[PDB]
Amino acid sequence: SIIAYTMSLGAENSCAYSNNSIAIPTNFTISVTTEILPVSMTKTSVDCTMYICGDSTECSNLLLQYGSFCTQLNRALTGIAVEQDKNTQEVFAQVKQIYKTPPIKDFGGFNFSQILPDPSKPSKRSPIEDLLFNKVTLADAGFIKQYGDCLGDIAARDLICAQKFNGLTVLPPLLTDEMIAQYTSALLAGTICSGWTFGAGPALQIPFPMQMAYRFNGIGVTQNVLYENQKLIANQFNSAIGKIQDSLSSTPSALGKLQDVVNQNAQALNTLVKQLSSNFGAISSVLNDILSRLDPPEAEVQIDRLITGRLQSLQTYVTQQLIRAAEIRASANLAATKMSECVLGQSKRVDFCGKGYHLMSFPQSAPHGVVFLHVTYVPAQEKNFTTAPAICHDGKAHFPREGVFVSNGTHWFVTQRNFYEPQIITTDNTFVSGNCDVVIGIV
């Protein structure tokens, strides 16, 4: 039955604020998450006279009484269409050097097969890209029309030939899907072979495991961890990617953002056409009925009423498209930023390149958008330890050079902040400054 209840805000949880007590991770996992951003709108345009007059001569003569209105409507829509290609270009064409995808080589156990393009397909998409592609549904069934379906199926509620009828059109993108896939492939090839160096300048060859070692040091995990846990890390990575493709397949809501852009734009046009059939207080929405039943001046009155009606509908349409265009531009700008900072680098911004500590990312294309796979490091199993700000030795106060002093009761060790790896405290691990009296809680 339907029930009503108070919202829970989150799981109740706890930790204890406690002095001389810390927790240090002892294990970790590699997590990969997915972020989706829209990049573009369908590019469209409108013939203001076909929409308003339908080639009626009397209407055109009266439409000319509102001189710049068509120019303003047409320019606004044109400007939107121009921006849609610029948005696409900025998000994907960041690197003009196309690095060909290498044959699979020894990447130290790291498997990129669901990320890289599938050589056997008619469309050079990765398994993930093909999935994203197949899931989003578009109403914009071509630009230059084929007549197989346009003439075969009539009175079957179609759209793009209906738009043609009313002078509405859909324009092709300049950059095609295969071309986008090629840019994506170049970025992936670049990232896998040279890390971020190809972004900054020349693409330097770096063994894949070393690129990872540097990314770990970037987080704050000493690189020896990678070389010793390389098999675990590679296995967790490979597993996570497989899980993502399955998650995208089973969770249809994942692409709701891209589907939403498409649906809203389709509705705006369907609405515009429906408004066209309305009378707007006129004796008929059809100019030909107005003319056949009326002498010239009476027809002029009814025609002018419809011109106002149709023109007002066009102004409404264009205004809404401009507002939506501003938002799609903002999304595209964000997407472009994310690619430079998450794909062509290793941003430290919190919650910017996925949750957890950003390690690396890979772009995938999608209809009207971009999908990023964000690989992050997340601490896992942890243990409770005793701590102190300094060790007192001969009256001098010793601080960790790089780390935290920690003990298991009987003995004090020094570890790196994010991963338990106890070392004997030695002079080579300490910074010395001041005496034992000034530091509070020195042991």
Ligand X SMILES: *[C@@H]1O[C@H](CO)[C@@H](O)[C@H](O)[C@H]1NC(C)=O
Ligand Y SMILES: *[C@@H]1O[C@H](CO)[C@@H](O[C@@H]2O[C@H](CO)[C@@H](O)[C@H](O)[C@H]2NC(C)=O)[C@H](O)[C@H]1NC(C)=O
- Identify residues 43-102 at the interface with another protein (CB under 8 A): 45, 47, 50, 55, 78, 85, 93, 95-100, 102
Using rule CB under 6 A, residue 440 touches ligand X: yes
* CB closer to a second copy, 85 vs 421: 421
Looking at the Cβ atoms of 12 and 428, the one nearer to a second copy is 428
Instruction: Rule CB under 8 A: say whether 250 interacts with another protein.
Output: no
The least CB distance from residue 393 to ligand Y, in Å, is: 17
Contact between 355 and 376 (Cβ < 8 Å): yes
Q: Per-residue x/- marks for another protein, 325-354, CB under 8 A? A: x--x--xx-xx--x---------------x
Q: Whose CA is closest to 213, among 193, 199, 228?
A: 228
Q: Which of 384, 408, 423, 435 binds ligand X (CB under 6 A)?
A: 384
16-53 as b/e, with b when 16 or more CB fall inside 10 Å?
eeeeeebebbeebbbbbbbbbbbbbbbbbebebbebbb
Considering beta carbons, is residue 26 or 224 the nearer one to a second copy?
A: 224
The contacts of residue 241 (CB under 8 Å, 6+ apart) are 32, 111, 112, 114, 115, 373
Does position 384 bind another protein by CB under 8 A? yes
**Strand, helix or coil for residue 337:** helix
Binding residue (CB under 6 A) for ligand X from 1, 6, 8, 19: 19
Query: Sign of the C-alpha dihedral, residues 190, 195, 199, 201?
Result: negative
Query: Which residues, numbered 130-189, are part of the site for ligand X (CB under 6 A)?
Result: 144, 146
Positions touching ligand Y (CB under 6 A) are 27, 29, 111, 113-114, 127, 232, 235-236, 242, 381, 408-411
Applying CB under 6 A, the span of 155-163, 240-248, 257-265, 380-388 interacting with ligand X comes to 380-388
* 196 forms part of the interface with another protein (CB under 8 A): no
Q: Beta strands of 190-285 (E only): which ranges?
A: none
Distance, in Å, from the CA atom of 362 to the CA atom of 246, rounded to the nearest integer, reads: 17
Which of 25-33, 125-133, 203-211, 214-222 is the region at the interface with another protein (rule: CB under 8 A)?
203-211
Among 274, 383, 401, 411, binds ligand X (CB under 6 A): 383
Whether the Cβ atoms of residue 236 and residue 132 lie closer than 8 Å to each other = no
- Burial class (CB within 10 angstroms; exposed 0-12, middle 13-18, buried 19+) of 362: buried
Provide the binding-site residues for ligand X, judged by CB under 6 A: 16, 18-20, 23, 106, 144, 146, 382-384, 440-441
